[PDB]
């Protein structure tokens, strides 16, 4: 602390007197990360865990709003065939809150795995279902050979080869109408210049690579100016009282200690501030408790010393801090 006087005053000769150098501050050690409860789970079992399905034009959306969906146990397990998407990682979907979540179920052939892409053209995606260019989600295939398959084929659901024009995304066309190539009217049946688009499924587990049933769920993600009612889970830490720590909350980041607060609070209130707009009281997200936020213990350091040609003896003054609070 004699050398703390020489660094602040920028001189090697210290005159006789009292000089203020720096401020003592207790540094934080641990960190508290909090996240709320996983309660009110959402029915995601109508797509992934569902027994039945539909065809590629017959697909039924599942409306997911105002609930907590758990994708976190699926990413740590992952019995997934192929997941491919563009620009948004599927492992980064768990900590983000999304406003509009839509999900569907449709089963495709094994040559149609490359026919599901953002911006995909062909005889499959343009005539049945394709992904738009502004689509921010990601798609996960799942192997249907242990549940959804059938011996020798599936004759219950059929798919459409052809369509008279190109079909937009966010469209469901259930129509049975025959594609007309020429000027001859087809009248609902095949004939001259008429192709019959309806083909049965070839799906069996004992056939080859080029046709296999695959459960394909498209997760439609949309972020609007409304706040998000659907969030994914996040692993949190414990709660430490009466120690100097860093704060990581949902709506707050700071540094201080946690003490018991006697102030009353609102049930819709997370945090509240004082005159300086600094948060002195916070609600715990998991359970109902109010904690008084106080900053860590600080004080000024004054150095009492004689001259450098007289003595090296150092007397240290701690201003505002009692002697029991020095350790």
């Amino acid at each position: 602390p004699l050398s703390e006087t020489k660094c602040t005053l920028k001189s090697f000769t210290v005159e006789k007197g009292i000089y203020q150098t720096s401020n003592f501050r207790v540094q934080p050690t641990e960190s508290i990360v909090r996240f709320p409860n996983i309660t009110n789970l959402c029915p995601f079992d109508e797509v992934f865990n569902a027994t039945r399905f539909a065809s590629v034009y017959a697909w039924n959306r599942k409306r997911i709003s105002n609930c907590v969906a758990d994708y976190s146990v699926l990413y740590n397990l992952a019995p997934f065939f192929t997941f491919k998407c563009y620009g948004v990682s599927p492992t980064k979907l768990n900590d983000l809150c999304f406003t509009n979540v839509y999900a569907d179920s449709f089963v495709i052939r094994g040559d149609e795995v490359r026919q599901i892409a953002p911006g995909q053209t062909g005889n499959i995606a343009d005539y049945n279902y394709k992904l738009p260019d502004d689509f921010t989600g990601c798609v996960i295939a799942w192997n249907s050979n242990k549940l959804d398959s059938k011996v020798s084929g599936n004759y219950n659901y059929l798919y459409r080869l052809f369509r008279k024009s190109n079909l937009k995304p966010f469209e469901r066309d259930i129509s049975t109408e025959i594609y007309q190539a020429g000027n001859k009217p087809c009248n609902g049946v095949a004939g001259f210049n008429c192709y019959f688009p309806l083909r049965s499924y070839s799906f069996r587990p004992t056939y080859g690579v080029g046709h296999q049933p695959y459960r394909v769920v498209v997760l439609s993600f949309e972020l609007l100016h409304a706040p998000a009612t659907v969030c994914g889970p996040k692993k949190s830490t414990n709660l430490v009282k009466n120690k100097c720590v860093n704060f990581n909350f949902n709506g707050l980041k700071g540094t201080g200690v946690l003490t018991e607060s006697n102030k009353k609070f609102l049930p819709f209130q997370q945090f509240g501030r004082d005159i300086a707009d600094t948060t002195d009281a916070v609600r715990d997200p998991q359970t109902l408790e109010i904690l008084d936020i106080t900053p860590c213990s600080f004080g000024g350091v004054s150095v009492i010393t004689p001259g450098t040609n007289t003595s090296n003896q150092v007397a240290v003054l701690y201003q505002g801090v009692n002697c029991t609070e020095v350790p």
């Binding site: 300086a276 900053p295 600080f298 000024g300 201003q319 505002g320």
Partner: peptide, 22 residues
């Protein structure tokens, strides 16, 4: 007739020692 980083320096001469000058 509450600490944001602003402190109040105490005075040197106390008010009991002012009255012994008085």
């Amino acid at each position: 007739t509450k600490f944001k980083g602003l402190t109040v320096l105490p005075p040197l001469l106390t008010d009991e020692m002012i009255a012994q000058y008085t």
